[PDB]
Amino acid sequence: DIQMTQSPSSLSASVGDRVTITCRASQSISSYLNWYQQKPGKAPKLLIYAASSLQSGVPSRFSGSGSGTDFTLTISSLQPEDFAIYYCQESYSTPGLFTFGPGTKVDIKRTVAAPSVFIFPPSDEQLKSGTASVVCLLNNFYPREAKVQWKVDNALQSGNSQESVTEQDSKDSTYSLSSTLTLSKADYEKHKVYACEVTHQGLSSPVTKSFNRGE
Amino acid sequence: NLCPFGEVFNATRFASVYAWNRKRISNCVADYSVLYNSASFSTFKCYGVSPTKLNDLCFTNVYADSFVIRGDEVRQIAPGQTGKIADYNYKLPDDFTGCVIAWNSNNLDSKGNYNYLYRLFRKSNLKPFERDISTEIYQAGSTPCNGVEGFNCYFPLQSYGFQPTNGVGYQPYRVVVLSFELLHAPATVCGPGS
Amino acid sequence: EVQLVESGGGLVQPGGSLRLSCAASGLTVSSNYMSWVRQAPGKGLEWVSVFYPGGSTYNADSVKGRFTISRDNSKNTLYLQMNSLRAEDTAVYYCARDAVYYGMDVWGQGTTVTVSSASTKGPSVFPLAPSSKSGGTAALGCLVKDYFPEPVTVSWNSGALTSGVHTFPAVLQSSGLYSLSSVVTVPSSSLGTQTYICNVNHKPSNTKVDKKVEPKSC
Ligand SMILES: *[C@@H]1O[C@H](CO[C@@H]2O[C@@H](C)[C@@H](O)[C@@H](O)[C@@H]2O)[C@@H](O[C@@H]2O[C@H](CO)[C@@H](O)[C@H](O)[C@H]2NC(C)=O)[C@H](O)[C@H]1NC(C)=O
16 A cells, blocks of 8 residues: 655744645556645545646645655645645556555644643532533633643553644634543542643743642 | 467557457467466466467467466456456357466556556457557447537547556456367477477 | 545444445546545544555554445445444545645545444433622533433523533443533523523434423422
């Protein structure tokens, strides 16, 4: 098979910028490479075929380039409708179940904004049912990259949390993140200090929010 | 007089697979085990005959078909196979009697070489030993193409794009298919030990 | 004009079967390399099955022995028969025409397949109470836990509170039930006086829940 990689994983740009995205192929597949754009919840849309030909109906600000092993897609002046994920695709392998690149996300650039961090203990109502959800909120931050580290009595927790992130806000271009630590009621009552430690570019050092069970 | 196998196996130029060449071998002595004991072949699969026993056999005629394909496609040159090559370019019958011989020709058919083509678009599969050389624009919808490429209108052939940089699965391979014909007629192609 | 229209997606138990259809207009299915491509939640595109113009068909190893692609020329329709379905087959399924050198230029809108053994269940709604610790902005919310299937909608104060609200994407827990949180930032000054209620609707279970979120008494 052929493995395909794109660079970068994510890019920040402003309306009117000149954006270039690159794609790498496990083999040299000549000009057999296509470019697609995908918006959340919609099917991919063909932008470039045969590495350089503009798909009919696609605005002229899109252009393709490259040959052999490495290819670049270019947007000459980024428009508001161009914020999306961009995939490259080889058209070479047998028997036609081709491989897509991993995708480059282009999001909206703005000033760095540190998250405001909040931790929430489990409600007494939930604890009656035998489960404890501790929630950490990272509100209105930029850029997207952020790390949440859960600690229980200063022991770093791995494998018992899930998180999700909002789409970039249409008004202020920030992200928000929610992380949930789940424990049984029995384990929750075996420990005192519950802490959420957040690392982000807008913070000089990691910020920790915490509570003591039973206040 | 010996059969002209060197004319086929050592030809300087090989055909594209969609336009595969056929040479009819007739009225001559064939030294198959000279070919068989050679070490130059990455593939030497025979069907209906044994390679060692070939020099003791006679056939009505022998056909030598030759073309260039990709290394990962050589597996399609066998009975009962499917794929872009077997379906639309060169098809062996299910009751095939003969030998498929192939060797890596990276050092010969790779310059970026875009000369070698295969047929990509075809509405039905080839019959065994059918050869389709048409270049008509392929009509992928209900609208006639009138000889111009466009939406639902594709040129049926595409180039292999052989780059000598790539792995062996994507390298060019020269193929010779020997098919052995046996009819109720004089046997004009005999091995030396007949 | 030129379009592909998928149908047949739905919810099915593991081990069950489903048949997707893709009705074409503006291209001939039997004359094209026609594909089924799926996208799992948050993941990339995965090729499932391909139908060659001349009749050959191929399956990805991930669905070998379980999925069968087929077509009906009279109806100009492509099908995907999915048997022995598994939880990881959950995805949006697209049909598409592949003009290999000219790209995959025509895509359907997609149809959603959800494979799960979970029972339909309305969520529990728990408060994310504002911290007792504060002369600025406070955060509060609701935790909408253990429901199936998607979706849930959340409003605040019956729509009177919209600014500062963030309702997060749901996570699928190991139980097979979904959970999400909705939060809002408000002036700390308002915590003693302004009432904050999250309105949660889960139509699959006919569940509507209002939960008042207030500072916790010590
Ligand atoms: C195809 O050619 C090879 C090689 O022939 C050698 O190189 C050519 C450029 C030319 O100079 C020939 O005269 C050379 O013999 C043939 O292989 C050889 O066979 C001869 C016996 O006829 C033997 O003496 C050599 O050692 C062999 N060399 C190798 C590398 O195997 C081969 O027989 C030809 N193919 C057919 C079907 O006849």
